[PDB]
Amino acid sequence: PIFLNVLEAIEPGVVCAGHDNNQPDSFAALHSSLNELGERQLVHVVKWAKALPGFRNLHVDDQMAVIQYSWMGLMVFAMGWRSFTNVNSRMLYFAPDLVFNEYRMHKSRMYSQCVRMRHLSQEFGWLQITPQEFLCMKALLLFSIIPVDGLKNQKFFDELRMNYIKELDRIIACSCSRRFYQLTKLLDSVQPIARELYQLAFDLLIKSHMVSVDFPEMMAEIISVQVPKILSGKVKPIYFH
Ligand SMILES: C[C@]12CCC(=O)C[C@@H]1CC[C@@H]1[C@@H]2CC[C@]2(C)[C@@H](O)CC[C@@H]12
Numbered sequence: 001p002i003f004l005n006v007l008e009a010i011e012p013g014v015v016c017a018g019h020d021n022n023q024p025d026s027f028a029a030l031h032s033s034l035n036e037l038g039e040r041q042l043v044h045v046v047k048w049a050k051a052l053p054g055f056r057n058l059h060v061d062d063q064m065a066v067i068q069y070s071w072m073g074l075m076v077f078a079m080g081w082r083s084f085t086n087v088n089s090r091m092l093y094f095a096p097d098l099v100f101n102e103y104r105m106h107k108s109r110m111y112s113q114c115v116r117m118r119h120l121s122q123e124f125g126w127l128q129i130t131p132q133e134f135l136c137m138k139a140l141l142l143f144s145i146i147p148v149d150g151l152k153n154q155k156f157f158d159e160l161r162m163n164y165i166k167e168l169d170r171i172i173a174c175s176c177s178r179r180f181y182q183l184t185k186l187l188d189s190v191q192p193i194a195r196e197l198y199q200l201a202f203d204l205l206i207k208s209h210m211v212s213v214d215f216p217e218m219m220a221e222i223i224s225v226q227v228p229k230i231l232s233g234k235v236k237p238i239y240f241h
Protein backbone atom coordinates (compact mmCIF):
# COMPACT_ATOMS: atom_id res chain seq x y z
CA PRO A 1 0.00 0.00 0.00
CA ILE A 2 2.80 2.34 -1.00
CA PHE A 3 0.77 5.25 -2.36
CA LEU A 4 -1.50 5.56 0.69
CA ASN A 5 1.43 5.15 3.10
CA VAL A 6 2.92 8.26 1.49
CA LEU A 7 -0.21 10.43 1.51
CA GLU A 8 -0.95 9.67 5.16
CA ALA A 9 2.73 10.18 6.02
CA ILE A 10 2.98 13.63 4.39
CA GLU A 11 -0.43 14.94 5.48
CA PRO A 12 -0.03 18.31 7.28
CA GLY A 13 -0.92 18.49 10.94
CA VAL A 14 -2.67 21.24 12.86
CA VAL A 15 -2.20 24.80 11.65
CA CYS A 16 -3.29 27.67 13.91
CA ALA A 17 -4.52 31.03 12.64
CA GLY A 18 -3.01 33.10 15.45
CA HIS A 19 -6.40 34.63 16.12
CA ASP A 20 -7.13 36.46 19.40
CA ASN A 21 -10.55 35.05 20.21
CA ASN A 22 -10.98 37.52 23.07
CA GLN A 23 -11.21 40.52 20.89
CA PRO A 24 -14.56 41.30 19.24
CA ASP A 25 -15.52 39.79 15.88
CA SER A 26 -14.96 42.66 13.49
CA PHE A 27 -14.57 42.44 9.73
CA ALA A 28 -10.98 43.63 10.08
CA ALA A 29 -9.94 41.17 12.79
CA LEU A 30 -11.60 38.15 11.18
CA HIS A 31 -10.07 38.73 7.73
CA SER A 32 -6.69 39.61 9.20
CA SER A 33 -6.71 36.18 10.82
CA LEU A 34 -8.04 34.42 7.71
CA ASN A 35 -5.28 35.96 5.63
CA GLU A 36 -2.59 35.08 8.18
CA LEU A 37 -3.97 31.54 8.24
CA GLY A 38 -3.67 31.45 4.45
CA GLU A 39 -0.03 32.52 4.56
CA ARG A 40 0.70 29.85 7.16
CA GLN A 41 -1.12 27.06 5.31
CA LEU A 42 0.65 28.02 2.06
CA VAL A 43 3.94 27.03 3.69
CA HIS A 44 2.56 23.58 4.46
CA VAL A 45 0.95 23.12 1.04
CA VAL A 46 4.32 23.79 -0.63
CA LYS A 47 6.13 21.23 1.55
CA TRP A 48 3.27 18.73 1.12
CA ALA A 49 3.11 19.06 -2.69
CA LYS A 50 6.90 18.66 -3.10
CA ALA A 51 6.73 15.35 -1.19
CA LEU A 52 3.98 13.88 -3.36
CA PRO A 53 4.89 10.81 -5.44
CA GLY A 54 6.04 12.00 -8.85
CA PHE A 55 5.65 15.74 -8.21
CA ARG A 56 9.34 16.50 -8.78
CA ASN A 57 9.07 14.98 -12.28
CA LEU A 58 7.29 18.22 -13.18
CA HIS A 59 9.38 21.08 -14.49
CA VAL A 60 10.28 23.36 -11.58
CA ASP A 61 8.17 26.26 -12.89
CA ASP A 62 5.15 24.02 -13.38
CA GLN A 63 5.63 22.89 -9.79
CA MET A 64 5.12 26.45 -8.53
CA ALA A 65 2.38 27.24 -11.07
CA VAL A 66 0.26 24.26 -10.08
CA ILE A 67 0.57 25.06 -6.37
CA GLN A 68 -0.18 28.72 -7.04
CA TYR A 69 -3.41 27.94 -8.93
CA SER A 70 -4.80 25.09 -6.83
CA TRP A 71 -4.09 26.31 -3.30
CA MET A 72 -7.62 27.62 -2.70
CA GLY A 73 -9.35 24.42 -3.77
CA LEU A 74 -6.91 22.40 -1.66
CA MET A 75 -7.30 24.55 1.44
CA VAL A 76 -11.10 24.65 1.16
CA PHE A 77 -11.32 20.89 0.63
CA ALA A 78 -9.12 20.26 3.67
CA MET A 79 -11.04 22.81 5.75
CA GLY A 80 -14.27 21.02 4.86
CA TRP A 81 -12.78 17.74 6.05
CA ARG A 82 -11.70 19.38 9.33
CA SER A 83 -15.20 20.82 9.77
CA PHE A 84 -16.83 17.45 9.12
CA THR A 85 -14.75 15.56 11.72
CA ASN A 86 -14.55 18.30 14.37
CA VAL A 87 -17.92 20.12 14.51
CA ASN A 88 -19.84 17.97 11.95
CA SER A 89 -20.20 21.01 9.67
CA ARG A 90 -22.72 23.54 10.99
CA MET A 91 -19.65 25.59 11.87
CA LEU A 92 -16.52 26.11 9.78
CA TYR A 93 -13.29 24.83 11.34
CA PHE A 94 -10.77 27.01 9.58
CA ALA A 95 -8.37 26.42 12.49
CA PRO A 96 -8.57 25.38 16.17
CA ASP A 97 -8.37 29.10 17.08
CA LEU A 98 -10.66 30.31 14.26
CA VAL A 99 -14.00 28.50 14.12
CA PHE A 100 -16.79 30.37 12.36
CA ASN A 101 -20.23 30.38 13.89
CA GLU A 102 -23.16 32.07 12.19
CA TYR A 103 -22.33 35.48 13.68
CA ARG A 104 -18.76 35.39 12.34
CA MET A 105 -20.10 34.17 9.00
CA HIS A 106 -22.11 37.39 8.88
CA LYS A 107 -19.53 39.82 10.27
CA SER A 108 -16.88 38.55 7.84
CA ARG A 109 -19.31 39.48 5.03
CA MET A 110 -18.86 36.06 3.46
CA TYR A 111 -22.00 34.34 4.70
CA SER A 112 -23.08 32.95 1.29
CA GLN A 113 -19.57 31.64 0.55
CA CYS A 114 -19.45 30.05 4.00
CA VAL A 115 -22.85 28.49 3.23
CA ARG A 116 -21.39 26.78 0.14
CA MET A 117 -18.25 25.74 2.04
CA ARG A 118 -20.51 24.28 4.74
CA HIS A 119 -22.38 22.33 2.05
CA LEU A 120 -19.09 20.96 0.68
CA SER A 121 -18.15 19.95 4.22
CA GLN A 122 -21.39 18.04 4.75
CA GLU A 123 -20.87 16.02 1.58
CA PHE A 124 -18.07 14.18 3.37
CA GLY A 125 -20.84 12.79 5.58
CA TRP A 126 -23.55 12.43 2.94
CA LEU A 127 -21.21 10.37 0.74
CA GLN A 128 -19.44 8.69 3.69
CA ILE A 129 -15.99 9.68 2.43
CA THR A 130 -13.22 7.56 3.92
CA PRO A 131 -9.89 9.04 5.06
CA GLN A 132 -8.15 7.20 2.21
CA GLU A 133 -10.62 8.64 -0.28
CA PHE A 134 -10.23 12.15 1.13
CA LEU A 135 -6.44 11.91 0.82
CA CYS A 136 -6.44 10.69 -2.80
CA MET A 137 -9.11 13.24 -3.75
CA LYS A 138 -7.14 16.10 -2.20
CA ALA A 139 -3.98 15.06 -4.04
CA LEU A 140 -5.90 15.13 -7.35
CA LEU A 141 -7.01 18.70 -6.63
CA LEU A 142 -3.38 19.78 -7.06
CA PHE A 143 -3.49 18.52 -10.66
CA SER A 144 -6.90 19.96 -11.53
CA ILE A 145 -6.23 23.50 -12.75
CA ILE A 146 -3.80 24.72 -15.46
CA PRO A 147 -3.12 27.54 -17.95
CA VAL A 148 -5.20 27.18 -21.09
CA ASP A 149 -1.85 27.55 -22.89
CA GLY A 150 -0.52 24.46 -21.09
CA LEU A 151 2.37 24.08 -18.68
CA LYS A 152 6.05 24.10 -19.55
CA ASN A 153 6.00 20.30 -19.71
CA GLN A 154 2.34 19.48 -20.19
CA LYS A 155 3.06 15.87 -21.18
CA PHE A 156 4.54 14.98 -17.78
CA PHE A 157 1.59 16.72 -16.14
CA ASP A 158 -0.97 14.72 -18.12
CA GLU A 159 0.74 11.47 -17.14
CA LEU A 160 1.06 12.37 -13.47
CA ARG A 161 -2.60 13.37 -13.32
CA MET A 162 -3.52 10.11 -15.06
CA ASN A 163 -1.64 8.28 -12.30
CA TYR A 164 -3.50 10.11 -9.55
CA ILE A 165 -6.81 9.26 -11.21
CA LYS A 166 -5.71 5.63 -11.37
CA GLU A 167 -4.90 5.80 -7.64
CA LEU A 168 -8.30 7.23 -6.78
CA ASP A 169 -9.83 4.39 -8.79
CA ARG A 170 -7.58 1.97 -6.88
CA ILE A 171 -8.69 3.00 -3.39
CA ILE A 172 -12.32 2.73 -4.48
CA ALA A 173 -11.80 -0.73 -5.99
CA CYS A 174 -9.73 -1.85 -2.98
CA SER A 175 -20.85 -0.55 -7.02
CA CYS A 176 -17.45 0.89 -7.90
CA SER A 177 -18.89 2.69 -10.94
CA ARG A 178 -21.35 4.74 -8.89
CA ARG A 179 -18.67 5.54 -6.31
CA PHE A 180 -16.23 6.92 -8.87
CA TYR A 181 -19.03 8.97 -10.42
CA GLN A 182 -19.98 10.36 -6.99
CA LEU A 183 -16.38 11.21 -6.07
CA THR A 184 -15.55 12.84 -9.41
CA LYS A 185 -18.72 14.95 -9.13
CA LEU A 186 -17.63 16.06 -5.65
CA LEU A 187 -14.17 16.99 -6.97
CA ASP A 188 -15.71 18.99 -9.83
CA SER A 189 -17.86 20.86 -7.26
CA VAL A 190 -14.79 22.27 -5.48
CA GLN A 191 -13.76 24.51 -8.36
CA PRO A 192 -16.80 26.85 -8.50
CA ILE A 193 -16.45 27.32 -4.73
CA ALA A 194 -12.73 28.08 -5.10
CA ARG A 195 -13.52 30.59 -7.86
CA GLU A 196 -15.96 32.46 -5.65
CA LEU A 197 -13.34 32.69 -2.92
CA TYR A 198 -10.73 33.77 -5.46
CA GLN A 199 -13.05 36.57 -6.58
CA LEU A 200 -13.66 37.55 -2.94
CA ALA A 201 -9.94 37.42 -2.10
CA PHE A 202 -9.11 39.60 -5.10
CA ASP A 203 -11.84 42.14 -4.35
CA LEU A 204 -10.77 42.48 -0.71
CA LEU A 205 -7.10 42.81 -1.67
CA ILE A 206 -7.97 45.73 -3.94
CA LYS A 207 -10.19 47.33 -1.29
CA SER A 208 -7.68 46.90 1.52
CA HIS A 209 -4.90 48.23 -0.71
CA MET A 210 -7.13 51.26 -1.38
CA VAL A 211 -7.17 51.93 2.40
CA SER A 212 -3.50 50.88 2.77
CA VAL A 213 -3.96 47.73 4.87
CA ASP A 214 -1.57 45.02 3.69
CA PHE A 215 -2.12 41.31 3.17
CA PRO A 216 0.69 39.00 4.26
CA GLU A 217 3.43 38.96 1.69
CA MET A 218 2.81 35.65 -0.11
CA MET A 219 -0.98 36.12 -0.09
CA ALA A 220 -0.62 39.61 -1.54
CA GLU A 221 1.69 38.30 -4.25
CA ILE A 222 -0.42 35.28 -5.24
CA ILE A 223 -3.67 37.24 -5.22
CA SER A 224 -2.26 40.06 -7.36
CA VAL A 225 -0.14 37.95 -9.78
CA GLN A 226 -1.79 34.51 -10.16
CA VAL A 227 -5.43 34.79 -9.05
CA PRO A 228 -6.32 37.29 -11.84
CA LYS A 229 -5.12 34.80 -14.44
CA ILE A 230 -7.86 32.57 -13.05
CA LEU A 231 -10.46 35.32 -12.84
CA SER A 232 -9.67 36.43 -16.40
CA GLY A 233 -9.84 32.89 -17.79
CA LYS A 234 -6.19 32.35 -18.65
CA VAL A 235 -6.04 29.49 -16.10
CA LYS A 236 -8.99 27.10 -16.04
CA PRO A 237 -10.05 24.06 -13.99
CA ILE A 238 -9.91 20.59 -15.46
CA TYR A 239 -13.34 19.07 -14.90
CA PHE A 240 -14.34 15.44 -15.10
CA HIS A 241 -17.91 15.94 -16.40
C1 LIG B 1 -7.83 29.76 2.38
C2 LIG B 1 -8.51 30.29 3.65
C3 LIG B 1 -7.59 29.99 4.85
C4 LIG B 1 -7.38 28.51 5.11
C5 LIG B 1 -8.67 27.74 5.16
O1 LIG B 1 -8.89 26.91 6.01
C6 LIG B 1 -9.66 28.07 4.08
C7 LIG B 1 -9.85 29.58 3.93
C8 LIG B 1 -10.81 29.88 2.77
C9 LIG B 1 -11.06 31.38 2.65
C10 LIG B 1 -9.76 32.15 2.43
C11 LIG B 1 -8.77 31.82 3.54
C12 LIG B 1 -7.49 32.62 3.32
C13 LIG B 1 -7.73 34.13 3.25
C14 LIG B 1 -8.81 34.50 2.23
C15 LIG B 1 -8.30 34.31 0.80
C16 LIG B 1 -9.44 35.89 2.39
O2 LIG B 1 -8.65 36.86 1.69
C17 LIG B 1 -10.80 35.76 1.67
C18 LIG B 1 -11.08 34.24 1.57
C19 LIG B 1 -10.05 33.64 2.54
